[PDB]
Amino acid sequence: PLGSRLFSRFDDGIKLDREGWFSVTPEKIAEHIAGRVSQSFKCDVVVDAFCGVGGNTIQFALTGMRVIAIDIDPVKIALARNNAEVYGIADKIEFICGDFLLLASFLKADVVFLSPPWAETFDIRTMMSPDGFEIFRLSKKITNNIVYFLPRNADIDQVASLAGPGGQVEIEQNFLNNKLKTITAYFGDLIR
Amino acid sequence: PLGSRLFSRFDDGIKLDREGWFSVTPEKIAEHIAGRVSQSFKCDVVVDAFCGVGGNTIQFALTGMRVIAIDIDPVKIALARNNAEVYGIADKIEFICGDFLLLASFLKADVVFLSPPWATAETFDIRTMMSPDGFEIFRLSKKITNNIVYFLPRNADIDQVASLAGPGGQVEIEQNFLNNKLKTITAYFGDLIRR
Amino acid sequence: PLGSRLFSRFDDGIKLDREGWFSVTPEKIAEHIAGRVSQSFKCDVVVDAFCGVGGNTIQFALTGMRVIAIDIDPVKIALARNNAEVYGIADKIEFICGDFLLLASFLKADVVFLSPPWAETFDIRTMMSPDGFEIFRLSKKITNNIVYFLPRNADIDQVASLAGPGGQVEIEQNFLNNKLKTITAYFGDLIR
Amino acid sequence: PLGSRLFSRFDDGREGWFSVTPEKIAEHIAGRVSQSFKCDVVVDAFCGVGGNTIQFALTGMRVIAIDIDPVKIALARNNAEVYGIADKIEFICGDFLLLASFLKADVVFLSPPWGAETFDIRTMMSPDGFEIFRLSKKITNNIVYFLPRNADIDQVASLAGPGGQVEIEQNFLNNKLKTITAYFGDLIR
Ligand SMILES: Nc1ncnc2c1ncn2[C@@H]1O[C@H](COP(=O)(O)OP(=O)(O)O)[C@@H](O)[C@H]1O
Ligand SMILES: Nc1ncnc2c1ncn2[C@@H]1O[C@H](COP(=O)(O)OP(=O)(O)O)[C@@H](O)[C@H]1O
Ligand SMILES: Nc1ncnc2c1ncn2[C@@H]1O[C@H](COP(=O)(O)OP(=O)(O)O)[C@@H](O)[C@H]1O
Ligand SMILES: Nc1ncnc2c1ncn2[C@@H]1O[C@H](COP(=O)(O)OP(=O)(O)O)[C@@H](O)[C@H]1O
């Protein structure tokens, strides 16, 4: 290891949902990440590399950013598409059904948001599919401004080693009720 | 084991999706189930008990049936709601976020559709390997109606499944194939059985 | 308007200044209604159709009945759930956030309790939102055992007509300090 | 009209919230007041069921939450527990105007009841918006006034005194003006 790592905190919490329950959902963190990214230097276009049902994609688009939302699964794309439609921000999003690793080399964007398919320590190389180092390498062809959404037990030496020697990484730790839940790693101009 | 068991077959297949891929998705089976159910005797209202993102709910609503769509997860309900909105059939559906086992005693419908949360073993035990308990799920569904659809893994215990119909009762086991390999089964009960 | 109208009385308890309750239906009246409903023939499950923060719901639940409590406002539902737990009867209630008129055709219950959103004579078709006749029609799909909580100036011809031609209605008049405040109308097997 | 008026903007995010003050702006408000110099204790003067109270409490501030209606207070107590911050709050059921002269706090948050092209805070709030502010001033200079879009900024600015400073934070929902948050004292900037 040979670079500076910033450690920060974000506190997740219960929300009052439209069903009348007090719930913990992905939305609070997604909104926080989107808010941060959209305020960073020259960050107008984001690739949501593994968009799934479009939770993060929606949050990016709601800040006025343009999104290239990618998922290998056409059922996920259709769902994400419908989801964006009702939020009234579908015109901010281009959905592409395909393999991010095969698309990455042909894209132009200011940011790549990474939430890939995810044990005492988490090995991003052997425990993600595809290879979490390969995911980042391909993201790097597009931009240095990368967000990595990672489990709490993720190897911080590995994560920091992605910044290159000796690059900076912010490790934003996500807490619920004072217990560590997940980590959001920021790279490039996303660090504050 | 006592009573009748009918074995039937449905073939799944590739579809040409709007992304320009040839793919297999849950839609074809879901559409088939909705078609069959909607043609059955006096079947106008269905409870989709574990609706998830609303795949089966959409297919039921698309045939003209009213749907009570239930999921314990409000994130799923939201997605299902938005999904239905775009299809132009949201007015056919009432979404309830809650536990099906706590809601079932208070519902009125003609049909219950069950696709509950499913070890990797040779035989699937519906009592122990489903949460909640698959016999308990069925028992609560019976308070509503005899017309019940159960979507189950290929290795489901047919003796168990047939025992849900009770001693001397009828079940239909509709086997779902993709390229001649068995993928899943759809069990029909009550007036939903063929003929 | 042909049929039978019974007129009864209930005397509300005097409340000191600055005391308040969760519902426009006073606690003592709700208690009285719940007590009456729970002793009626085969009356174990009640729908509280416009439950608010659960003032009436709590009173039904305290008698041992099971309650389907419905409100279109997710804030009310979430506050209602909290209240149910305070009174130790959350296990007796199923809260549903939704439109009563849309949910009614899918419910199973023994009793429906109606306290809908409201100068000289009160018109239930005109001065309730939604339409008071419509609310009753939908409640009728569930059961004949209906309780209608109404203003003192409610048109008794209208109220009686809901019972159908030749039908029976009970108009329980609610008195606070020997002055008329409100009415509670009973239908079906709830009539004394 | 005299003194200084700083202007700022905040962009908001079948869903409902406990307060007329949206969760996110209350969050925003509680965030910047808890950042302010020696601001540890806040009076939520018309707390209702505690929507704003919760947000102040979540920053780690202590809250004196006041409401004249005992139903609101009881509901607020439950909510505080759900959010795990009940030990940060003292609820008091009473009239803020009658309790104000007896309180000690660093911040007063005002979101009074209402009771027109231009909003007159003196005649269109119940009680009088000037009276409310005067009583809050006995406690502290650090006051937050949550107000409708059509608020008379001359009137609002006059609360700061001759040559006084006020910050008018405009709350936008989808590029459109919704409400304003006025800051006084050390809460400005
Ligand atoms: N190579 C890939 N490129 C783009 N998207 C992918 C790729 N591999 C998987 N995905 C998608 O990434 C998302 C997250 O994966 P996963 O955690 O498996 O799904 P889930 O949320 O259903 O459990 C899924 O929506 C999946 O379709
Ligand atoms: N008791 C319940 N009542 C209603 N819905 C439930 C209940 N238990 C689980 N569910 C929901 O039923 C579906 C079961 O699917 P499951 O296999 O667990 O999830 P997933 O589709 O994410 O893999 C989920 O959408 C889950 O939220
Ligand atoms: N169609 C409806 N279905 C169910 N509940 C409703 C409907 N319309 C209004 N409500 C609820 O009925 C309750 C009574 O309404 P209202 O008298 O307007 O109350 P309030 O002044 O207390 O908000 C409210 O809690 C409201 O949310
Ligand atoms: N003098 C007062 N002191 C403290 N709280 C008050 C006073 N007057 C009103 N309140 C409270 O202020 C809150 C807001 O008032 P209002 O807008 O009337 O509320 P709402 O429409 O939510 O009932 C209410 O919760 C009310 O109880």
UniProtKB/Swiss-Prot annotation, chains A, C:
Binding, S-adenosyl-L-methionine: D71
Tissue: Ubiquitously expressed. High expression in heart, skeletal muscle, kidney, liver and placenta.
Keywords: Cytoplasm, Methyltransferase, Nucleus, Phosphoprotein, S-adenosyl-L-methionine, Transcription, Transcription regulation, Transferase
Main location: cytoplasm
GO cellular component, one term: cytoplasm
Region (Sufficient for catalytic activity) residue spans: 5-191
GO molecular function, one term: RNA cap trimethylguanosine synthase activity
Annotated consequence of substituting N56A: Decreases catalytic activity to 5 percent of wild type
Binding residues annotated for N(7)-methylguanosine, in chain numbering: W118
Recorded superkingdom: Eukaryota
GO terms for biological process, alphabetical: 7-methylguanosine cap hypermethylation; ribonucleoprotein complex biogenesis; spliceosomal snRNP assembly
UniProt family annotation: Belongs to the methyltransferase superfamily. Trimethylguanosine synthase family.
Function recorded in the entry: Catalyzes the 2 serial methylation steps for the conversion of the 7-monomethylguanosine (m(7)G) caps of snRNAs and snoRNAs to a 2,2,7-trimethylguanosine (m(2,2,7)G) cap structure. The enzyme is specific for guanine, and N7 methylation must precede N2 methylation. Hypermethylation of the m7G cap of U snRNAs leads to their concentration in nuclear foci, their colocalization with coilin and the formation of canonical Cajal bodies (CBs). Plays a role in transcriptional regulation.
Name listed for the protein in its UniProt record: Trimethylguanosine synthase
The organism of origin for this protein: Homo sapiens (Human)
Residues included from the entire protein: 653 to 847 of 853
From Swiss-Prot, chain B:
Expression (tissue specificity): Ubiquitously expressed. High expression in heart, skeletal muscle, kidney, liver and placenta.
Region (Sufficient for catalytic activity): 5-193
Record annotation: effect of changing F7A: Loss of catalytic activity
Protein localization: Cytoplasm; Nucleus, Cajal body; Nucleus, Nucleolus
Entry binding sites for N(7)-methylguanosine: W118
Sequence positions that bind S-adenosyl-L-methionine: D71
Annotated consequence of substituting T25A: Decreases catalytic activity to 13 percent of wild type
Subunit composition and interactions: May form homooligomers. Interacts with CREBBP/CBP, EED/WAIT1, EP300/P300, NCOA6/PRIP, PPARBP/PBP and SMN.
Family listed: Belongs to the methyltransferase superfamily. Trimethylguanosine synthase family.
Function: Catalyzes the 2 serial methylation steps for the conversion of the 7-monomethylguanosine (m(7)G) caps of snRNAs and snoRNAs to a 2,2,7-trimethylguanosine (m(2,2,7)G) cap structure. The enzyme is specific for guanine, and N7 methylation must precede N2 methylation. Hypermethylation of the m7G cap of U snRNAs leads to their concentration in nuclear foci, their colocalization with coilin and the formation of canonical Cajal bodies (CBs). Plays a role in transcriptional regulation.
Record protein name field: Trimethylguanosine synthase
Organism: Homo sapiens (Human)
Residues of the full protein shown: 653 to 848 of 853
